[PDB]
Tab-separated table of C-alpha atoms and ligand atoms in Angstrom:
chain	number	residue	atom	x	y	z
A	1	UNK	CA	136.917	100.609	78.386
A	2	UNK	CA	134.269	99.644	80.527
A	3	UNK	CA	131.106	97.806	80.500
A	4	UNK	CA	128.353	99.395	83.053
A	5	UNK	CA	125.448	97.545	83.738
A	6	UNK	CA	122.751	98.667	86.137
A	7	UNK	CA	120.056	96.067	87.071
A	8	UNK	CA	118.130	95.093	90.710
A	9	UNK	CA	119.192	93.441	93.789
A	10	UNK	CA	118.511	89.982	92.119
A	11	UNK	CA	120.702	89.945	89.309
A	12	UNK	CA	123.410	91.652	90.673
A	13	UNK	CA	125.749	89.006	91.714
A	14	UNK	CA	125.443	86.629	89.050
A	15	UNK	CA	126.009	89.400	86.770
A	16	UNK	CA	129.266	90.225	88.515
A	17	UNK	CA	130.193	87.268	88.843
A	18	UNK	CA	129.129	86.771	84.756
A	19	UNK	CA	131.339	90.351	84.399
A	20	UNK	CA	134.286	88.749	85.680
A	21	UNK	CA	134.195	85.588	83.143
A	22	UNK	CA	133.628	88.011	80.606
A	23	UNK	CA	136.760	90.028	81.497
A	24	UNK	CA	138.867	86.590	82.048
A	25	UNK	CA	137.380	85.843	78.323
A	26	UNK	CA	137.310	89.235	76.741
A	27	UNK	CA	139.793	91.295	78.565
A	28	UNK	CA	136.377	94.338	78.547
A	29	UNK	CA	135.700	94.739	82.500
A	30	UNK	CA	132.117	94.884	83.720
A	31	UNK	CA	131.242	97.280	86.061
A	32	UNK	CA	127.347	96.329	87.715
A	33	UNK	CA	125.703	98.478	89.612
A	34	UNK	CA	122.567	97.992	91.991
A	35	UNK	CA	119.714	100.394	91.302
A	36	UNK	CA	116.541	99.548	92.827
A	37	UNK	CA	113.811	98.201	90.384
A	38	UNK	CA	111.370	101.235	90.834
A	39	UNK	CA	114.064	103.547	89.809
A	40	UNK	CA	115.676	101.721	86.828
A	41	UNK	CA	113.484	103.328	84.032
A	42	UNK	CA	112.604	106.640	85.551
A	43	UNK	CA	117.079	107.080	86.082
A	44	UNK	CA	117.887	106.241	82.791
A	45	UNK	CA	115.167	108.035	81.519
A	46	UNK	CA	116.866	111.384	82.613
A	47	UNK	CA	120.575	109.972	82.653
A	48	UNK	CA	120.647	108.423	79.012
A	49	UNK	CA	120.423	111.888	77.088
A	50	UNK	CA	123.180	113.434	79.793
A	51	UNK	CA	125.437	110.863	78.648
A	52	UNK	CA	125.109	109.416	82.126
A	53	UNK	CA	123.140	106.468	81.705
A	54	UNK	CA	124.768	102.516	82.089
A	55	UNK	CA	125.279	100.753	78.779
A	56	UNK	CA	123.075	97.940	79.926
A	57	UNK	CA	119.928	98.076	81.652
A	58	UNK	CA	118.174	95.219	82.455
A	59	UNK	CA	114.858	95.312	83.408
A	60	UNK	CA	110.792	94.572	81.923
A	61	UNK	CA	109.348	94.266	78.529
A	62	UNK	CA	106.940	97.011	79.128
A	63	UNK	CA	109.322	99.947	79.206
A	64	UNK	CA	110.523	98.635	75.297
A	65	UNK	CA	108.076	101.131	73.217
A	66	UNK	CA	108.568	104.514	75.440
A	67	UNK	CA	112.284	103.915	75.247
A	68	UNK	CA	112.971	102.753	71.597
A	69	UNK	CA	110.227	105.479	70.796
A	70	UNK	CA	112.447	108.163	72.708
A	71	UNK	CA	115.879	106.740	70.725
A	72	UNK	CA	117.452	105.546	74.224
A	73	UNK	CA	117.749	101.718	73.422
A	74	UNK	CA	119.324	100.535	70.464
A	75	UNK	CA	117.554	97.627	68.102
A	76	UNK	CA	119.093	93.901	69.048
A	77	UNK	CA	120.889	92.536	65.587
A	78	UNK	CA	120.372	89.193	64.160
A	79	UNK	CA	122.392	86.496	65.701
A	80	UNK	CA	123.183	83.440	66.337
A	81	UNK	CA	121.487	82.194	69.638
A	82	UNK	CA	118.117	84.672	68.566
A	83	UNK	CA	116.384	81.505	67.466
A	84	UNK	CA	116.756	79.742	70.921
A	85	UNK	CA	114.458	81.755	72.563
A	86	UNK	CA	110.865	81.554	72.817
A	87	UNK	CA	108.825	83.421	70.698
A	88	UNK	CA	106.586	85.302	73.708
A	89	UNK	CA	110.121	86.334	74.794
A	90	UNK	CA	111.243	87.415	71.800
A	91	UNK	CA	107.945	89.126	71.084
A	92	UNK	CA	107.384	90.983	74.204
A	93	UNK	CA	111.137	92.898	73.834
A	94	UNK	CA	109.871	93.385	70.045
A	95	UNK	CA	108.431	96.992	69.038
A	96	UNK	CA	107.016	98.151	65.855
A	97	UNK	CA	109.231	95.148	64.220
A	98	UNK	CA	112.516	95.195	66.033
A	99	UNK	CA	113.865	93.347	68.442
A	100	UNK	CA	115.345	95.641	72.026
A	101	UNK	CA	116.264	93.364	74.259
A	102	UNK	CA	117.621	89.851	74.887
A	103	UNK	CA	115.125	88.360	77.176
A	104	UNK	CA	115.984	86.137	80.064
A	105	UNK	CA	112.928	85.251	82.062
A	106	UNK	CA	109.276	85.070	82.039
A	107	UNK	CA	107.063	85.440	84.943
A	108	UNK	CA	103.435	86.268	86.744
A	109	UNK	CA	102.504	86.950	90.257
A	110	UNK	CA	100.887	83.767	91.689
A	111	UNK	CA	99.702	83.139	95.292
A	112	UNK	CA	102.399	82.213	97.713
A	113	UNK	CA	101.364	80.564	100.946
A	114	UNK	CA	102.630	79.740	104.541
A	115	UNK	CA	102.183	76.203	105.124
A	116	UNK	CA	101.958	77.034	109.009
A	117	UNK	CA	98.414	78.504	108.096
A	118	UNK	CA	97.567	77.296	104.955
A	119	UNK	CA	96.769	73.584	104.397
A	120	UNK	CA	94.670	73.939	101.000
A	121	UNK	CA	94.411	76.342	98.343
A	122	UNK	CA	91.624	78.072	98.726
A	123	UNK	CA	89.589	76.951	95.563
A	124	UNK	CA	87.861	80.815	94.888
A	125	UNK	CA	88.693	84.336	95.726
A	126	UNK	CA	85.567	84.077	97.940
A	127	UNK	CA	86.845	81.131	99.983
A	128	UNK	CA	90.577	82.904	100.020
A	129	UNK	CA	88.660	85.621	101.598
A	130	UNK	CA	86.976	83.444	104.579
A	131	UNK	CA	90.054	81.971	105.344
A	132	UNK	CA	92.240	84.848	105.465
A	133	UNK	CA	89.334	86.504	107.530
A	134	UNK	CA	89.138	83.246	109.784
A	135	UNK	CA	92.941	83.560	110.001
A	136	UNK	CA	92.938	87.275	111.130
A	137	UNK	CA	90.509	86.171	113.826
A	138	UNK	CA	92.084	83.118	115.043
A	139	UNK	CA	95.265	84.310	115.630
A	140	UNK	CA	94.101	88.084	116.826
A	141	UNK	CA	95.455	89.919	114.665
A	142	UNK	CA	98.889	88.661	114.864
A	143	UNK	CA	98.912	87.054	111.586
A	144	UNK	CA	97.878	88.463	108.599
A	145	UNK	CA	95.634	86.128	106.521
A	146	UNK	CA	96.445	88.475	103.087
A	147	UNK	CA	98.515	91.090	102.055
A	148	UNK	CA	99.881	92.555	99.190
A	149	UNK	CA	100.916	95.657	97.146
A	150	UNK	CA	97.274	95.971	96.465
A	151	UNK	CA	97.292	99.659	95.291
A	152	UNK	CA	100.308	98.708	92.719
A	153	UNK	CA	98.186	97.867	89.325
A	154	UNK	CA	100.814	95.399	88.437
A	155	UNK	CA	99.614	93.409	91.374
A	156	UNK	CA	95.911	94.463	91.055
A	157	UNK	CA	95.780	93.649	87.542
A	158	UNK	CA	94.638	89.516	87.563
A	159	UNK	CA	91.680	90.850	89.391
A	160	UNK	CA	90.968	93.740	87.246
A	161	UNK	CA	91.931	91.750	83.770
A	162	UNK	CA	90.293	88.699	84.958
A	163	UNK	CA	86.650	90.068	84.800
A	164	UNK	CA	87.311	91.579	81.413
A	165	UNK	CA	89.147	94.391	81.764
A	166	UNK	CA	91.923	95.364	79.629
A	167	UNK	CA	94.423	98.226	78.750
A	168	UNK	CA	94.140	98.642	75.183
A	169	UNK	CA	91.833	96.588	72.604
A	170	UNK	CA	93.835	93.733	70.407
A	171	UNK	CA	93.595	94.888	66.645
A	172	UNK	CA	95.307	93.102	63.684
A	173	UNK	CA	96.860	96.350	63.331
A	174	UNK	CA	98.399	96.432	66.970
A	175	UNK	CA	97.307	97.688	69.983
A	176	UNK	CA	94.127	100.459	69.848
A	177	UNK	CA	95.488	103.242	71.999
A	178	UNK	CA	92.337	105.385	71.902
A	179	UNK	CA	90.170	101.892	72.950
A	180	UNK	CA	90.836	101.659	76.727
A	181	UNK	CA	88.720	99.193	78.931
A	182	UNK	CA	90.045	99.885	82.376
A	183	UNK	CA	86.698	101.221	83.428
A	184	UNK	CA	84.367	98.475	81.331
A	185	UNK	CA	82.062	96.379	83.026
A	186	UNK	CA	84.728	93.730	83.730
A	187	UNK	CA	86.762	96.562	85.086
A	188	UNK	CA	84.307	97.758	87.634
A	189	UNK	CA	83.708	94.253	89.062
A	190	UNK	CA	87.287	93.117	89.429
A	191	UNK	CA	87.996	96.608	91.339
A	192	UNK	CA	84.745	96.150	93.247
A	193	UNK	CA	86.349	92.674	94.619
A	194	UNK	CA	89.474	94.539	95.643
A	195	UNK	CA	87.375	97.174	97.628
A	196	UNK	CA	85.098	94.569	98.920
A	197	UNK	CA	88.790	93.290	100.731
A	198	UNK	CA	89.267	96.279	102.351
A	199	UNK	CA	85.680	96.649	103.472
A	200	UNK	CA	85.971	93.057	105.117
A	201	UNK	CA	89.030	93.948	106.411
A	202	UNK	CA	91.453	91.474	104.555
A	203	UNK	CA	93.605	94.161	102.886
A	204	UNK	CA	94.047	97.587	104.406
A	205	UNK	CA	94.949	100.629	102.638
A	206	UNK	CA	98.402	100.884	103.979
A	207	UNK	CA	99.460	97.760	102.877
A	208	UNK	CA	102.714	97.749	100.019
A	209	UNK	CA	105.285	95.609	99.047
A	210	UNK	CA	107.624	95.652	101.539
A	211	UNK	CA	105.395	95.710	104.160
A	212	UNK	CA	103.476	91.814	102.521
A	213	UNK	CA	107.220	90.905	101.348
A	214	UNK	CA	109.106	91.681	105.109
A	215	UNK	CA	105.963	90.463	106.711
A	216	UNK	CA	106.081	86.840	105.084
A	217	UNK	CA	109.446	86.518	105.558
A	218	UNK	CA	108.858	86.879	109.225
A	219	UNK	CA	106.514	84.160	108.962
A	220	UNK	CA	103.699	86.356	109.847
A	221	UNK	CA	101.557	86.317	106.376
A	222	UNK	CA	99.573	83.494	105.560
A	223	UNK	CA	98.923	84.552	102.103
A	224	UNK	CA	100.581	87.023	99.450
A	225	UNK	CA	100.463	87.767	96.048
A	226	UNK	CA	104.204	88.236	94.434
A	227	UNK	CA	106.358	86.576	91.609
A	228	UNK	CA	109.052	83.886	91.274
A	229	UNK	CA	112.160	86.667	91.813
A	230	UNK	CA	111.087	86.342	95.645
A	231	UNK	CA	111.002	82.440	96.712
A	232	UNK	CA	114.927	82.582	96.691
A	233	UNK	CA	114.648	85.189	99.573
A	234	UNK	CA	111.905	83.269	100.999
A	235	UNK	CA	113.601	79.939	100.819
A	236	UNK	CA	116.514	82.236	102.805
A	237	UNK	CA	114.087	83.028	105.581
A	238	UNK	CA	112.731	79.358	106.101
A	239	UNK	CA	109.563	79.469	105.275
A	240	UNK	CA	107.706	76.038	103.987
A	241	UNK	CA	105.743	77.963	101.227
A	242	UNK	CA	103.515	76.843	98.428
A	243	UNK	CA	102.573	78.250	95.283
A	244	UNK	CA	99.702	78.311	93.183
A	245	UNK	CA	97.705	80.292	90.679
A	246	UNK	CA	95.760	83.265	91.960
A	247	UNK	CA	91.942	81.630	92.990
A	248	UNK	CA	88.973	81.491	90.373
A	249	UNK	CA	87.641	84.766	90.593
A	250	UNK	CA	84.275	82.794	89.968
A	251	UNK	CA	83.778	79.242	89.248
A	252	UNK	CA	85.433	78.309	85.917
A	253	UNK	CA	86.413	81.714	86.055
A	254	UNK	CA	90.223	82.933	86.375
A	255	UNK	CA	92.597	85.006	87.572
A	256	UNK	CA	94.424	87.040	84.661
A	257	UNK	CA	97.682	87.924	85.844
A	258	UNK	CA	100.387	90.576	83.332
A	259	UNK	CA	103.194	88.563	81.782
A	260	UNK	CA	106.502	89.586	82.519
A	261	UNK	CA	109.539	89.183	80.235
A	262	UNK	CA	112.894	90.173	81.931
A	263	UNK	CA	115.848	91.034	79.812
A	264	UNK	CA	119.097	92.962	78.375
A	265	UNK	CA	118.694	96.379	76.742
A	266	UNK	CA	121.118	98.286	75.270
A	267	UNK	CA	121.475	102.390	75.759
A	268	UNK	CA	121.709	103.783	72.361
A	269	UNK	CA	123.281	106.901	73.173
A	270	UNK	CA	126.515	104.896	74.864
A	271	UNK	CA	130.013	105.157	73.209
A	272	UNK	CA	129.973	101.271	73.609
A	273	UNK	CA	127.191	100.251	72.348
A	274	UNK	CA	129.010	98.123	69.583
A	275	UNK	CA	131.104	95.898	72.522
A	276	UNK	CA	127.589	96.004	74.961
A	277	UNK	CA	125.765	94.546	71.931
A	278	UNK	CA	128.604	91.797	71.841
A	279	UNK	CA	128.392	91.104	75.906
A	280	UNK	CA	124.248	90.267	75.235
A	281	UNK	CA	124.303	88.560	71.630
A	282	UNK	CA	128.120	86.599	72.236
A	283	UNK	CA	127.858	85.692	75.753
A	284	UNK	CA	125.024	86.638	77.769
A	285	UNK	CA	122.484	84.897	75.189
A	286	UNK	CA	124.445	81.478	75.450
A	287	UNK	CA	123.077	78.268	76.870
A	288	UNK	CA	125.652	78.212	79.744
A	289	UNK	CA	125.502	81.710	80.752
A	290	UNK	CA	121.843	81.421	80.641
A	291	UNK	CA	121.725	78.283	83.180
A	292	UNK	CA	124.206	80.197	85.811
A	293	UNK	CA	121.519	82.983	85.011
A	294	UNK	CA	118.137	80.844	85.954
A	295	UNK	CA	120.459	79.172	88.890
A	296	UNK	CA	121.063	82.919	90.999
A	297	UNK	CA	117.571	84.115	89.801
A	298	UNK	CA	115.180	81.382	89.126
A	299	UNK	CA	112.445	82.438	86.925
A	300	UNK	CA	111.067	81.117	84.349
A	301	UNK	CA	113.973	80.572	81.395
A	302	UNK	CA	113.440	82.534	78.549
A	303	UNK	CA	115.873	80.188	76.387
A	304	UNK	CA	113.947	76.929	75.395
A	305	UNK	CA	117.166	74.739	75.905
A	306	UNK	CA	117.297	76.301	79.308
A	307	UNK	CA	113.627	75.781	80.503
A	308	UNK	CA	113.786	72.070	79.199
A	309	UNK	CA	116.277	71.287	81.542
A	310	UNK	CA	114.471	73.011	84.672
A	311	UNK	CA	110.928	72.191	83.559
A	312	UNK	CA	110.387	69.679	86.539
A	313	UNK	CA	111.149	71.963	89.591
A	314	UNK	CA	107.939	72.562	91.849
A	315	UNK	CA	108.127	76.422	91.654
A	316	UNK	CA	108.592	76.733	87.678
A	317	UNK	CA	105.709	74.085	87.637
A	318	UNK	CA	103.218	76.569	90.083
A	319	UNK	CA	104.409	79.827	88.561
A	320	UNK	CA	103.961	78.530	84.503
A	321	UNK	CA	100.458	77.480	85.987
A	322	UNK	CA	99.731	80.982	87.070
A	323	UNK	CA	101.023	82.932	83.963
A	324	UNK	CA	99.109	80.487	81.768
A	325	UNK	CA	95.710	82.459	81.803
A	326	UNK	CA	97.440	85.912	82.155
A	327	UNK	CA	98.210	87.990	79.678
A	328	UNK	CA	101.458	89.968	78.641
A	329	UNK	CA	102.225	93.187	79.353
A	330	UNK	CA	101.497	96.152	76.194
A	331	UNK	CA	105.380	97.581	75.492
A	332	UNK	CA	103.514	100.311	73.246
A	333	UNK	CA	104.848	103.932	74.284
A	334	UNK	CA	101.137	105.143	75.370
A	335	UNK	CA	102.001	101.863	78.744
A	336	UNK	CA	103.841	104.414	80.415
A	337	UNK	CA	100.852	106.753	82.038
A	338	UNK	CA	98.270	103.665	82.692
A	339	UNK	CA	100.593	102.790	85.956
A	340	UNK	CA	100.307	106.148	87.307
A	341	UNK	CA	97.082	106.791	86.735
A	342	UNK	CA	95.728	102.991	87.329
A	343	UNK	CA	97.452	103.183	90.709
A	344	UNK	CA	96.406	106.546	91.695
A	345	UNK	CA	92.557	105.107	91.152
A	346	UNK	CA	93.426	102.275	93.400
A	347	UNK	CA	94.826	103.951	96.136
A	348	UNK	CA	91.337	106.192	95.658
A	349	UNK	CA	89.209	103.200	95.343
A	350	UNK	CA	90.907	101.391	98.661
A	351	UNK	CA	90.822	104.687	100.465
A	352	UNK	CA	86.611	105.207	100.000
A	353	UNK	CA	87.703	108.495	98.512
A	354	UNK	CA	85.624	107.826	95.339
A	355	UNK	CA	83.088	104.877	94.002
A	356	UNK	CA	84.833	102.344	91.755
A	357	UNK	CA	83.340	103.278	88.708
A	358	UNK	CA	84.151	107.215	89.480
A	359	UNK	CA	87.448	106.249	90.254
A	360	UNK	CA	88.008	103.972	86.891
A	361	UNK	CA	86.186	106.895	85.254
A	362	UNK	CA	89.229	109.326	86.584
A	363	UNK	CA	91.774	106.846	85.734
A	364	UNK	CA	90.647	106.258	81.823
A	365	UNK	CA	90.109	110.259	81.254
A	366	UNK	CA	93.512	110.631	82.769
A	367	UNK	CA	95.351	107.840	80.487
A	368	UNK	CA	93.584	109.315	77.342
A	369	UNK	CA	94.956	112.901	78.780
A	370	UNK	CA	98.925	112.197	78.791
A	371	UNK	CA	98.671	109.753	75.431
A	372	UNK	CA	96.996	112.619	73.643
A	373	UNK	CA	99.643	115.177	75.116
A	374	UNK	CA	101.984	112.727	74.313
A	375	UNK	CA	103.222	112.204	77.863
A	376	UNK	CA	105.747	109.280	76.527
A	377	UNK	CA	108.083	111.842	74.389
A	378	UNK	CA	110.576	113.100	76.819
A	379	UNK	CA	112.768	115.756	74.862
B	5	LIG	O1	104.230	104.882	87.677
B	5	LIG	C1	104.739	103.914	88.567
B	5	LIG	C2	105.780	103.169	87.929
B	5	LIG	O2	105.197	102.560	86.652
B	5	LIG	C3	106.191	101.787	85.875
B	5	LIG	O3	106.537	100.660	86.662
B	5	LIG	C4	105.886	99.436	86.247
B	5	LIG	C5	106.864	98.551	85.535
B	5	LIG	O4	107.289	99.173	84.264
B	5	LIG	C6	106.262	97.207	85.232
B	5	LIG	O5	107.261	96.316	84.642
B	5	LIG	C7	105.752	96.521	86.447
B	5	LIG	O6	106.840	96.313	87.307
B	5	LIG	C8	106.857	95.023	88.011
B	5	LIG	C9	107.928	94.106	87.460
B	5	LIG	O7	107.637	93.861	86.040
B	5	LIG	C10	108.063	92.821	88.208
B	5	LIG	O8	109.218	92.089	87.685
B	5	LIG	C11	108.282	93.092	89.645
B	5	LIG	O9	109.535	93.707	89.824
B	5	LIG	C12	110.435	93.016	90.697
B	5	LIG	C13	111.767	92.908	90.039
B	5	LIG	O10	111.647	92.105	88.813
B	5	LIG	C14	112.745	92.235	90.905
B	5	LIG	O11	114.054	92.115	90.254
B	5	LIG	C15	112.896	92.884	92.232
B	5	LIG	O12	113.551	94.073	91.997
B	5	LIG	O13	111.607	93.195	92.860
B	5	LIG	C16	110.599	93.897	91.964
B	5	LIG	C17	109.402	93.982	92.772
B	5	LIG	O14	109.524	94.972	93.817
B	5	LIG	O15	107.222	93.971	90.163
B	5	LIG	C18	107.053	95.314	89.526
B	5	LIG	C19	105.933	95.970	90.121
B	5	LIG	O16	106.275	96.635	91.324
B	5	LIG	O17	104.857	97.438	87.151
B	5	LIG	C20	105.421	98.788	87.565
B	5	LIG	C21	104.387	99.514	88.250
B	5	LIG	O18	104.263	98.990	89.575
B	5	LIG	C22	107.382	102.615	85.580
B	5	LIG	O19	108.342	101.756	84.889
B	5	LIG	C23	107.991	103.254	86.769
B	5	LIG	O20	109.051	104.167	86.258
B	5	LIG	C24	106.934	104.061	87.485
B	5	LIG	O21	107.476	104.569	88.686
């Protein structure tokens, strides 16, 4: 009997290290294994059925519908330690009224400056703009005054939500998959501002994650948009950073960033589901293993207890200021296609390939495409 957990770089030692107090506890060893984030879904996707797939995955909120949907996560039971975390944790893992994973962080992008080049925030998108562009001058080229995964919607979103965009319309029935506003007005301008970035020549179309995320660590970006799982690797590389909430869009006017819940699922289809379950509701969920959690990954605690006695610390302070106007992810199956097809459009848009609107256009047609196919049932 073993206990296989796959999960990103971030978590994986503490969760070793959690493994081996569960063994010295339990006598069930823990097995973790690194996969990188990107691959964690789309793996277990086409391992689970095989019988291949780790008992735990840990990973985001969003994937919850499309999985529980495709019977490859099993529904959390009552227990014990359930009322100890927030509510928005607890709902975001929740689909169609159960409960699929035990959550352990919350978390938005924010801005995430060099204090070398950055003395103020800059108050508005427009004046972020001037100063990266003064930066890019004044230091020819050197430096770069912003960067970041800008064709990635998950990164592109606050700019695309903010104007009054959104994936699906709110209902009191749930989520209206057939009433998409990714290419509404709101839409259209917040894309428009992207595009206006590359025109000025403060983003260019090559730019991606590792190349903003390598790039500030080298002390060579003034400015970047990413979330709290990357000041501990930052810290690690020296830089005197700040944080801050993405810039008014407009005056009065901000940012909308996704919310991010980060948590414990359990593969339905494993032989040990029973002892997994145990390992998240018995031991993982606890106060204590939740604190040595938040103290090798620092984001946001998803167990009130936990946040209360972290509330203080500079970063949690910047990065609850940033998610506070964002929104949460949808978990609802139809999520799956709006990445693809919301980041093909931006790589379109930041290319000149297409106008905004065309490209939105695309991007919308193609969403309402794979829902109506049913592109989220996998057989
Ligand atoms: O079609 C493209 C891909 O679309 C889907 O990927 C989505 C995710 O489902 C979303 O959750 C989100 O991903 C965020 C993530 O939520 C956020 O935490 C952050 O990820 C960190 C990670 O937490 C951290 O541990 C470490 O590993 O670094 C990651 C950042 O590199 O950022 C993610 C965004 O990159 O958005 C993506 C789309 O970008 C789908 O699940 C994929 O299968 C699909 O390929």
């Amino acid at each position: 009997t073993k206990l296989t957990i796959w999960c990103s770089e971030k978590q994986v030692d503490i969760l070793q290290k959690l493994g081996e107090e569960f063994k010295a506890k339990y006598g069930i060893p823990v097995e973790v294994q690194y996969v990188d984030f990107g691959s964690i879904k789309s793996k277990f996707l086409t391992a689970a059925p095989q019988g291949q797939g780790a008992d735990i995955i840990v990973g985001a909120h969003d994937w919850v519908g499309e999985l529980a949907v495709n019977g490859l996560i099993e529904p959390i039971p009552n227990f014990s330690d359930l009322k100890n975390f927030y509510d928005t944790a607890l709902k975001a893992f929740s689909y169609g009224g159960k409960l699929y994973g035990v959550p352990y962080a919350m978390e938005a992008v924010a801005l995430i400056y060099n204090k070398d080049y950055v003395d103020s925030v800059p108050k508005t998108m427009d004046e972020l703009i001037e100063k990266a562009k003064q930066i890019d001058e004044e230091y020819g080229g050197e430096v770069r005054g912003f960067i970041y995964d800008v064709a990635n919607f998950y990164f592109s979103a606050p700019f695309i939500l903010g104007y009054g965009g959104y994936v699906f319309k709110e209902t009191p029935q749930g989520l209206d998959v057939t009433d998409i506003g990714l290419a509404n007005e709101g839409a259209v301008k917040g894309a428009k501002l992207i595009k206006r970035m590359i025109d000025e020549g403060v983003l260019t179309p090559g730019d991606n994650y590792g190349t903003m995320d390598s790039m500030f660590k080298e002390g060579l970006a003034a400015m970047i948009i990413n979330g709290l799982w990357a000041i501990k690797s930052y810290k690690d590389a020296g830089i005197n950073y700040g944080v801050a909430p993405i810039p008014e869009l407009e005056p009065g006017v901000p940012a909308k960033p996704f919310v991010g819940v980060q948590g414990f699922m359990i593969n339905a289809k494993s032989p040990n589901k029973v002892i997994a379950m145990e390992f998240l509701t018995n031991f993982i969920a606890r106060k204590e293993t939740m604190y040595k959690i938040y103290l090798a990954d620092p984001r946001l605690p998803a167990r009130k207890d936990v946040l209360e006695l972290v509330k203080d610390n500079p970063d949690v302070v910047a990065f609850t200021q940033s998610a506070s106007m964002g929104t949460p992810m949808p978990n609802v199956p139809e999520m799956a296609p709006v990445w693809s097809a919301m980041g093909d459009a931006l790589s379109i848009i930041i290319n000149g390939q297409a106008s905004v609107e065309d490209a939105l256009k695309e991007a919308v047609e193609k969403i309402k495409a794979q829902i109506e196919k049913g592109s989220h049932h996998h057989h």
